[PDB]
Amino acid sequence: NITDMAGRSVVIPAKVERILLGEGRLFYAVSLLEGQKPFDRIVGWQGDFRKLDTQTYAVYKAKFPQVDNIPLIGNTTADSISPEKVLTLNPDIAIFGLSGHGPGKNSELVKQLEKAGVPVVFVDFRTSPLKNTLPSMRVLGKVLHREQQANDYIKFYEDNVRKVTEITSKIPADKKPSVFIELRAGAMEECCGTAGKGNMGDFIDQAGGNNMAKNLLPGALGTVNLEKVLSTNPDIYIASGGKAPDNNAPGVSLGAQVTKEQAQSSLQTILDRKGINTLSAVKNGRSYGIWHNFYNSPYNVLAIQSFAKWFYPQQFADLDPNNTMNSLYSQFLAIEPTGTYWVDST
Amino acid sequence: ENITDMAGRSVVIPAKVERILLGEGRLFYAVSLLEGQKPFDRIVGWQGDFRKLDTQTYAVYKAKFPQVDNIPLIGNTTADSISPEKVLTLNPDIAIFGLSGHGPGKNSELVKQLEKAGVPVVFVDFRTSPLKNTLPSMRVLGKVLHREQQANDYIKFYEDNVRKVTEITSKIPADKKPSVFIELRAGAMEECCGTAGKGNMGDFIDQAGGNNMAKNLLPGALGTVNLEKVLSTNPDIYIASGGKAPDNNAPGVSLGAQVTKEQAQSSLQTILDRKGINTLSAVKNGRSYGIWHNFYNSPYNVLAIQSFAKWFYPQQFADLDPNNTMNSLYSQFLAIEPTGTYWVDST
Amino acid sequence: ENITDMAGRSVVIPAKVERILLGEGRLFYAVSLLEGQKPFDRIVGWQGDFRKLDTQTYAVYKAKFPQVDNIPLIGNTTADSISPEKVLTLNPDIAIFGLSGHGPGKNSELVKQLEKAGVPVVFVDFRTSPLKNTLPSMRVLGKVLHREQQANDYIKFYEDNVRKVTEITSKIPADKKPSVFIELRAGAMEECCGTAGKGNMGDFIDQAGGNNMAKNLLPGALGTVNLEKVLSTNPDIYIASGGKAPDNNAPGVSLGAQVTKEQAQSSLQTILDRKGINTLSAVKNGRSYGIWHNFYNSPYNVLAIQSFAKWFYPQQFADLDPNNTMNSLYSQFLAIEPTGTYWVDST
Ligand SMILES: N=C(N)NCCC[C@H](NC(=O)c1cccc(O)c1O)C(=O)N[C@@H](CO)C(=O)O
Ligand SMILES: N=C(N)NCCC[C@H](NC(=O)c1cccc(O)c1O)C(=O)N[C@@H](CO)C(=O)O
Ligand SMILES: N=C(N)NCCC[C@H](NC(=O)c1cccc(O)c1O)C(=O)N[C@@H](CO)C(=O)O
Ligand SMILES: N=C(N)NCCC[C@H](NC(=O)c1cccc(O)c1O)C(=O)N[C@@H](CO)C(=O)O
Ligand SMILES: N=C(N)NCCC[C@H](NC(=O)c1cccc(O)c1O)C(=O)N[C@@H](CO)C(=O)O
Ligand SMILES: N=C(N)NCCC[C@H](NC(=O)c1cccc(O)c1O)C(=O)N[C@@H](CO)C(=O)O
Ligand SMILES: [Fe+3]
Ligand SMILES: [Fe+3]
């Protein structure tokens, strides 16, 4: 038996072959365990990975066209999941997130699955990445019978994060740069989405930054008004996005099918917005883009490294997130790394 | 032919023993010193604490003895989870229990049931009063299990290896002794900070010539002291106990048979990086250490008394090496090979 | 409604409060700023520290309110002496506790008992982290006791009176600051010398633009530094805290509601005449002072921050008078008349 991220006891199945993904992008944690056979044990998933990660999807489709035939249990919201379609896939395990675009610990679907005799595991990369990322992988390892892959990934992760924390854990608060992260910048109805005590805030903390929204918000995600950002006038501005290159909607283009030219061109649009464009950080060129889906992925060590190099350029001159990304893919994944997951303003 | 156990009770020695019941699984450690190359041959069943709270030492014995998985578990990790029915159907001819711990005590119903069933019960203790009880416990186990030679051999080994410490620390006056705080299962409890009073690992601090800051804060062998009380006392030496497996992302110190030094140093450091702890003088000065938790209930505890002495007086015990003591212990008495890290220093 | 206390815990605000339990008696000081001319009307019971460790302020309130003697004492001066049974039979509708001090903390059993009984518990702090916690504590007490107006009035008063200091001392560079040692309950402890680190009266030294010599000697808010370490550091300014009653022949500094300037100066001098202390440069040069100890846990601590700034930079704060601040505090908020000596200079 194991304790999941909701504190609940889960009896590990003897053999797993029918994994249900409550949130599609929980695939990222699964991908680190399944080696060259990524989709072999997925009976169905939330449609967020296919619809909100179109780039990473297309790359896996070109090498694995059977991905199109994995059933979508819903669209991009917990409320759109048919519990009936879920149960007819006869899962032998269901992986859910404490938060996100899929069911949480108190949903009806979780109770239905408990009545059906199906083990449910809660992980978390989104609410409390710092507390939860590694424990989540340890647990997924045990319940999916991929302890070796999991232990390998934890060692890789700890080592690559320790490269940052060995330095930033000793830096005193008054020497840290102030940071604002604008999630899905440009692309929300009301500006400005950001992270508080949690989510990408954990990355700012680890990378030795000072999140200006840490004390403005009670939860992991929330909203701060444009004028509050202008008034705080933080040292460093970071925008997250995952927009596909050939999408004329507002947002930052980043992901597997994005070139540096397009990442720079679209970040600039984001930085040219009224108000934003007068920020000291934007004028001084301390303005950056990070791929949004790192907000819910155990690949988040790539962002902690990208934030650290932006917060202390020379102290992390020698650190290369692209090499960490390449080591990750070659050691663990079944596709080749492409595209741009981070960008600096021209 | 009768013996007095650690509960003051007389126990008549069985003519032949072949079905030993272990009230606490980790009481196996005392048994292992007697059974030579046939460690599990006489164990009918045991509490699940050894298998579930000592996964590393378990796995090593499993690789050499896969039949260990088939020894029945009479419960999980608490006295209240033991089914007395499963116990009695194993038809034990002796039951070994601890005065304290994760198994039944002298006043439990199960002890009375066993007395009604005609089964001798022996109380040992390595946990409440290690200094008073460890050697008497082994003497007794020797007599009731018909391994007097092994027991007497282990007592001589133990006394000699402890005397290496006490010859020096017994002459040191109180005012030249270091203040010490031991945080049991540091990082891994709900509320900080577990420790030992007059008993348990406190006995080891006493013997090794240290001054346990919790000796007078607590009435019993185990208890709790608040973080702020530790900060305020600001002791010269900080020690954290743990037994966490390397592959366990829960909080705590990794130590045991399957732990490397790098793993032990990295995980001790996490423990020392916690708010409050990290401002301790002992932590800043590098007088910060890790000890394997299960020494809190094992006659192998001479290893800890030695590690403490070398931490309490580094140069006066430069020449003492607990690893040589462990290697001699294993080769003389056990059926497995010593591996892993049972003690670590901070870098 | 709901609020966040000083332990990070959410507390549901009672609709009406009429039975306040004080975990530490001297938490009364925070309550007194809210209750106007009816100070004791809503107190069901309190720790005995206010009555036994603040005999002077007690006696003054007794002369105007003799019913104070009938408020139940839930214990003496230590968390361990509180009967949880007597507490629960008072049927409190709220309990106010301190993160630290002579009453229960966030992890005590009594706090859990009260949670089981359906009684809201609020943690405040004037003692561990006065700078971070004093004003947030008052805002919170305001909300849960339905005295938001009084609380907001006191915060404005406090901020303004502290700003009179910080406007000046916040711009002073470290190398122009005087070194300071504060000896808590000077002369009156078994082992010299109690003091404050990064917290407690240390926060006041920081705000008043001083350099606390124990800031980096200690991990916690309170601790101990040896006499010789003080002598060696030989700080610019020496401060002794006390609250001893005039007619008490025990050692310590006399300060409080019933102490005259001459009793405060005479008793400070005894404290400064002690072996070792009397060779300090600060003592010989007359930069030696007394501060009333209970400011170590009171939202009236703005009086200590102001007394400190005036000792640290006499001419820059020539025009500042902490006595006017106390009188403005008493007249605006309290139900008694200010008397006695809360601070003293050596002649
Ligand atoms: N399209 C919707 N109606 N909901 C979206 C899903 C869940 C929601 N998402 C976010 O708040 C969010 C914020 C910033 C950036 C993102 O990518 C986001 O997905 C959400 O998290 N809701 C909370 C509270 O209900 C939760 O599920 O815990
Ligand atoms: N809690 C909400 N109602 N909205 C916040 C999240 C929902 C929605 N998110 C996306 O469209 C999205 C796209 C790519 C990756 C993601 O994680 C996403 O969450 C959203 O942000 N909607 C905007 C309007 O488009 C909004 O509601 O502000
Ligand atoms: N999981 C539980 N509910 N109880 C655990 C077992 C019994 C308990 N153990 C400890 O207190 C303990 C403390 C520090 C370190 C350890 O390894 C521990 O096992 C226990 O000792 N109970 C006391 C009193 O009930 C006793 O048996 O004497
Ligand atoms: N007496 C108690 N109620 N708790 C303390 C002991 C119980 C538990 N112990 C262990 O997990 C354990 C592990 C390895 C070796 C041991 O000897 C153990 O006791 C424990 O400490 N639980 C924590 C919370 O999980 C706690 O009590 O706070
Ligand atoms: N009478 C006792 N045995 N203990 C008193 C408990 C409060 C204790 N007080 C001090 O340490 C103290 C030091 C200097 C000056 C003072 O006026 C003091 O009251 C205390 O603070 N305990 C801390 C740490 O244990 C706490 O409760 O967190
Ligand atoms: N926690 C401890 N063991 N000692 C520190 C404080 C205990 C005691 N305090 C007081 O008597 C006192 C008086 C007025 C106001 C306070 O806040 C007080 O704490 C104390 O100082 N004890 C002395 C012995 O006299 C000591 O322990 O050195
Ligand atoms: Fe989202
Ligand atoms: Fe235990």
mmCIF file with all atom_site columns, C-alpha atoms in Angstrom, chain C residues 1 9 21 47 52 55 70 75 89 101 104 107 112 139 207 242 251 295 338 341:
data_model
loop_
_atom_site.group_PDB
_atom_site.id
_atom_site.type_symbol
_atom_site.label_atom_id
_atom_site.label_alt_id
_atom_site.label_comp_id
_atom_site.label_asym_id
_atom_site.label_entity_id
_atom_site.label_seq_id
_atom_site.pdbx_PDB_ins_code
_atom_site.Cartn_x
_atom_site.Cartn_y
_atom_site.Cartn_z
_atom_site.occupancy
_atom_site.B_iso_or_equiv
_atom_site.pdbx_formal_charge
_atom_site.auth_seq_id
_atom_site.auth_comp_id
_atom_site.auth_asym_id
_atom_site.auth_atom_id
_atom_site.pdbx_PDB_model_num
ATOM 1  C CA . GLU C 1 1   ? -16.447 35.008 9.438  1.00 0.00 ? 1   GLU C CA 1
ATOM 2  C CA . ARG C 1 9   ? -4.325  28.713 11.278 1.00 0.00 ? 9   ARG C CA 1
ATOM 3  C CA . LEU C 1 21  ? -9.788  32.519 27.936 1.00 0.00 ? 21  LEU C CA 1
ATOM 4  C CA . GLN C 1 47  ? -3.003  31.969 33.258 1.00 0.00 ? 47  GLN C CA 1
ATOM 5  C CA . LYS C 1 52  ? 1.887   36.585 39.887 1.00 0.00 ? 52  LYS C CA 1
ATOM 6  C CA . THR C 1 55  ? 1.935   42.157 40.736 1.00 0.00 ? 55  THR C CA 1
ATOM 7  C CA . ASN C 1 70  ? -12.341 36.468 41.277 1.00 0.00 ? 70  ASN C CA 1
ATOM 8  C CA . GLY C 1 75  ? -2.593  27.624 36.244 1.00 0.00 ? 75  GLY C CA 1
ATOM 9  C CA . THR C 1 89  ? -15.578 23.875 32.737 1.00 0.00 ? 89  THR C CA 1
ATOM 10 C CA . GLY C 1 101 ? 5.734   32.046 26.561 1.00 0.00 ? 101 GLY C CA 1
ATOM 11 C CA . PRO C 1 104 ? 0.327   26.665 25.808 1.00 0.00 ? 104 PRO C CA 1
ATOM 12 C CA . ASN C 1 107 ? 1.005   21.896 19.511 1.00 0.00 ? 107 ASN C CA 1
ATOM 13 C CA . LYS C 1 112 ? -6.484  20.058 20.656 1.00 0.00 ? 112 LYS C CA 1
ATOM 14 C CA . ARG C 1 139 ? -5.859  43.442 13.864 1.00 0.00 ? 139 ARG C CA 1
ATOM 15 C CA . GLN C 1 207 ? 14.079  49.162 14.881 1.00 0.00 ? 207 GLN C CA 1
ATOM 16 C CA . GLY C 1 242 ? 13.452  43.810 35.136 1.00 0.00 ? 242 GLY C CA 1
ATOM 17 C CA . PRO C 1 251 ? 17.909  40.283 43.070 1.00 0.00 ? 251 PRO C CA 1
ATOM 18 C CA . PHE C 1 295 ? 7.636   44.821 27.277 1.00 0.00 ? 295 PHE C CA 1
ATOM 19 C CA . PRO C 1 338 ? -0.301  55.765 34.445 1.00 0.00 ? 338 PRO C CA 1
ATOM 20 C CA . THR C 1 341 ? 8.714   53.977 36.275 1.00 0.00 ? 341 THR C CA 1
#
